[PDB]
PDB file of C-alpha atoms in Angstrom:
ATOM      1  CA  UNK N   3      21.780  55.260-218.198  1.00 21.84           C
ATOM      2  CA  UNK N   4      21.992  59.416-217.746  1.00 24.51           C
ATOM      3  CA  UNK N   5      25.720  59.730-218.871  1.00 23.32           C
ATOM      4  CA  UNK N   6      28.413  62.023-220.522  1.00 24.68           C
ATOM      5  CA  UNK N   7      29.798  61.317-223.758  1.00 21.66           C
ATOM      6  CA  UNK N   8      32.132  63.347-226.408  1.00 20.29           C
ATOM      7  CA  UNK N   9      32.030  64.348-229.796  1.00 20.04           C
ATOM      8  CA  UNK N  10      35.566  64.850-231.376  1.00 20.11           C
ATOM      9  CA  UNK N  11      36.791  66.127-234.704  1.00 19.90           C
ATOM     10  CA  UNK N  12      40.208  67.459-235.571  1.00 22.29           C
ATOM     11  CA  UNK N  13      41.777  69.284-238.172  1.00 22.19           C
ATOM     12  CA  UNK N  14      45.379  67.958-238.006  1.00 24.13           C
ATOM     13  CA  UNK N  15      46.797  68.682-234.356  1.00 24.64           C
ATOM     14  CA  UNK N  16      43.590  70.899-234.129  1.00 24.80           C
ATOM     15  CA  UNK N  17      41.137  68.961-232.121  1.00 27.87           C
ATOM     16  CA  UNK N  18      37.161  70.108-231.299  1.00 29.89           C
ATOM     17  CA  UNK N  19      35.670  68.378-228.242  1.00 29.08           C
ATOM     18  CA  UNK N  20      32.003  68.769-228.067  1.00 30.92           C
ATOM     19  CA  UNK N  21      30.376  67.462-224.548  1.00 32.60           C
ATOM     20  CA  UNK N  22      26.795  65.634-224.921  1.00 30.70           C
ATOM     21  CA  UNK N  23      24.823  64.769-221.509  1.00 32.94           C
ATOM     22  CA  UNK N  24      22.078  62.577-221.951  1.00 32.35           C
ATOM     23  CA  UNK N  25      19.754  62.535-218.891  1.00 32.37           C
ATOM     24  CA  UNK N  26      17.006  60.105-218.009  1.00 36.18           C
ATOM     25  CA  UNK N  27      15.212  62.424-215.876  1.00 37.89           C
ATOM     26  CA  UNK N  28      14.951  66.021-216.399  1.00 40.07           C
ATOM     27  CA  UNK N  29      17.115  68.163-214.035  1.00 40.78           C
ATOM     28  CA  UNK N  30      18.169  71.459-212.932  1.00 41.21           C
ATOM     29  CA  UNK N  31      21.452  70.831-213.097  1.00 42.26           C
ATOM     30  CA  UNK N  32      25.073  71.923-212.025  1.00 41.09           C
ATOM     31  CA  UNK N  33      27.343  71.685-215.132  1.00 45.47           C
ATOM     32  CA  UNK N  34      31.186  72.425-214.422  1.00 44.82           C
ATOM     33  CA  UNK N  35      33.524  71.838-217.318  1.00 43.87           C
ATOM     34  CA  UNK N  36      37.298  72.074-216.602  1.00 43.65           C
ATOM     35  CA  UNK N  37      39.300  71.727-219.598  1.00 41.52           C
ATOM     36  CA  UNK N  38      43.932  71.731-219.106  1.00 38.75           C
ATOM     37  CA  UNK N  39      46.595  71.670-221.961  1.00 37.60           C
ATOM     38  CA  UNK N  40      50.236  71.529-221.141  1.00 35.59           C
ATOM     39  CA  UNK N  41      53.289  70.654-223.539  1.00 37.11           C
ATOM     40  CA  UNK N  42      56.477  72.006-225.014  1.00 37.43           C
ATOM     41  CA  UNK N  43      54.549  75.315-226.005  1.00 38.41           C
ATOM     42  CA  UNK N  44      53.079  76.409-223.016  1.00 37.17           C
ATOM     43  CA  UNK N  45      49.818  75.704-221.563  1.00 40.24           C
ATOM     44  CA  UNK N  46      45.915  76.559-221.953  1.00 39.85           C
ATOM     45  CA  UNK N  47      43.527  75.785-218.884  1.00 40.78           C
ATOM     46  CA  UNK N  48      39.521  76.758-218.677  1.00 46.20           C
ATOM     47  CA  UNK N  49      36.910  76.389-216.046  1.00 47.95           C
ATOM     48  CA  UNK N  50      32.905  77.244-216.066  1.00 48.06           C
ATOM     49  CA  UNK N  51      30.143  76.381-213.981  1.00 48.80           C
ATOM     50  CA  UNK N  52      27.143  77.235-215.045  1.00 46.30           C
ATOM     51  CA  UNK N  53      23.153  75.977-213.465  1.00 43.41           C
ATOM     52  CA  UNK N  54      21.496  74.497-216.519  1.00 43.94           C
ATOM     53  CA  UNK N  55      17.858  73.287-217.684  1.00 41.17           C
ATOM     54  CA  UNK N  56      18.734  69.480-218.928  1.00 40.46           C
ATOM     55  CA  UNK N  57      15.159  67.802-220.028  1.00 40.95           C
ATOM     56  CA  UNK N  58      15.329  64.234-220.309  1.00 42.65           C
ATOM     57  CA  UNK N  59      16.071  61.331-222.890  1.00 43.94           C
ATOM     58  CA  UNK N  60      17.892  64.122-225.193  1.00 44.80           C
ATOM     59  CA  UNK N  61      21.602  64.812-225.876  1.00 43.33           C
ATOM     60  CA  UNK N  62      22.551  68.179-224.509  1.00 44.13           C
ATOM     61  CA  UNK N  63      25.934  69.481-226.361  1.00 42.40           C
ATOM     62  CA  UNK N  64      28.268  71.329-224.204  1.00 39.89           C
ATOM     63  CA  UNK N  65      30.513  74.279-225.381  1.00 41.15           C
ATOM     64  CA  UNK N  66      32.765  73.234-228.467  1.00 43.18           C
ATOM     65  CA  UNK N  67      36.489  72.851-226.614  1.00 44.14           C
ATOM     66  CA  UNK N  68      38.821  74.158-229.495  1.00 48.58           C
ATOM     67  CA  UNK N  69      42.600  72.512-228.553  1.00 50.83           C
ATOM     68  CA  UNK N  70      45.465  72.606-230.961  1.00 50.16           C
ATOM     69  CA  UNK N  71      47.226  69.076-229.191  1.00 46.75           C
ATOM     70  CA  UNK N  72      50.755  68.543-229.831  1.00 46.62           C
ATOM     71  CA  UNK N  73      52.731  65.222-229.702  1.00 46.62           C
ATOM     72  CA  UNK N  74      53.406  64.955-225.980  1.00 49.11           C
ATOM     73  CA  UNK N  75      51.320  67.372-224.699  1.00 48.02           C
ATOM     74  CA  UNK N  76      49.410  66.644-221.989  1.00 49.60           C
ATOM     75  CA  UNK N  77      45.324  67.327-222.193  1.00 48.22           C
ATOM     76  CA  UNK N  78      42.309  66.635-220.381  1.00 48.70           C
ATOM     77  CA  UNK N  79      38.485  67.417-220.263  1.00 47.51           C
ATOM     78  CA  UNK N  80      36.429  66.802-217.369  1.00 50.34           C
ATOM     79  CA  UNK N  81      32.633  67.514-217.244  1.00 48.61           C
ATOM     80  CA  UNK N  82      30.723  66.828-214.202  1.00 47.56           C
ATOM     81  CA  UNK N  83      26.673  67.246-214.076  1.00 45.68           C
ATOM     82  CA  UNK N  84      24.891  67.213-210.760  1.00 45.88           C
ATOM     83  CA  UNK N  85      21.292  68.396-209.206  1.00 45.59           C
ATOM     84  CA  UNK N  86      22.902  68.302-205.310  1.00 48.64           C
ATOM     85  CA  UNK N  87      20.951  65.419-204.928  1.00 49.75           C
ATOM     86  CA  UNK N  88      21.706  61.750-205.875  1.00 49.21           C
ATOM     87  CA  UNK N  89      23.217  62.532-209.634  1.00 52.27           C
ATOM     88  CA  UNK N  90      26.361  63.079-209.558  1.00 50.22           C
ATOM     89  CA  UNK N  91      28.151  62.568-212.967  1.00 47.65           C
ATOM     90  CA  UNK N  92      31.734  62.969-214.213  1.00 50.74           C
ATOM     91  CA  UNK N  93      33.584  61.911-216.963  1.00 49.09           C
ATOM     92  CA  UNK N  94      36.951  62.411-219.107  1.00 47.90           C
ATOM     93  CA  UNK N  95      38.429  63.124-222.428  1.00 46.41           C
ATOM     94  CA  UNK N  96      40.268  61.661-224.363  1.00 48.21           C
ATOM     95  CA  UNK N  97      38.269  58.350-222.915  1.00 48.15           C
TER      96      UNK N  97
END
């Protein structure tokens, strides 16, 4: 059931994206977060990869994502956790 889920709050058009993985078995883990805004204003993009100590059965929050999101714009978080062997988990927001 090891799986990505997000946390979400927003002040008006400012939004704060929280990533929680939730493993079922402990893991040193590969944990890539790509994160792209694009509208009328311009545009915002972030990347990080980063080797992580996930235990098991216990939410692990990713970074806080800070986006001010604009009718129109166009947005998207993807976090993907691996261990190079047979996990390989991805996900999006908004869902």
């Amino acid at each position: 059931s090891s799986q990505i889920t997000f946390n979400t709050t927003q002040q008006g058009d400012m939004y704060t994206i929280i990533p929680e993985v939730t493993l079922t078995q402990s893991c040193l883990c590969r944990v890539q977060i790509l994160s792209l805004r694009e509208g009328s204003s311009g545009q915002s993009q972030t990347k990080q990869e980063k080797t992580l100590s996930l235990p098991a059965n216990q939410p692990i929050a990713l970074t806080k994502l800070s986006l001010n999101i604009s009718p129109d714009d166009r947005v998207k978080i993807v976090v993907t956790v691996s261990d190079g062997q047979s996990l390989h988990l991805s996900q999006q927001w908004p869902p």
